[PDB]
């Protein structure tokens, strides 16, 4: 019965969940984790991936 309120909470939570989940994607770089990108590559080649 309380569909409208439920939908509002569900949509907001799904947006936050997607925003947090997007931190796992590399976006074309070689690793999602920033520390690996900074360490494995030297600073002047690390910057472009970052």
């Amino acid at each position: 019965a309380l569909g409208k309120l439920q939908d509002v909470v569900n949509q907001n939570a799904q947006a936050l969940n997607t925003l947090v989940k997007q931190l796992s994607s590399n976006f074309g770089a070689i690793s999602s984790v920033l520390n690996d990108i900074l360490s494995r590559l030297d600073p002047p080649e690390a910057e472009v991936q970052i």
Binding site: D42, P43, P44, E45
Partner: protein
């Protein structure tokens, strides 16, 4: 410098002289100039004054 170590002396690159002897900022602006110098500097019998 010795001939084999010209290509290391550039912003962002390393090497023994590039590290402990002469290093450029990784964000350097300008020009680097080099040429063969056996004719005027090197002497027969061994040039070691450097």
């Amino acid at each position: 410098i010795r001939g084999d170590e010209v290509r290391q002396i550039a912003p962002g690159q390393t090497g023994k002289i590039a590290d402990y002897n002469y290093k450029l900022p990784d964000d350097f602006t300008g020009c680097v100039i080099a040429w063969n110098s056996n004719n005027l500097d090197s002497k027969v019998g061994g040039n070691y004054n450097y």
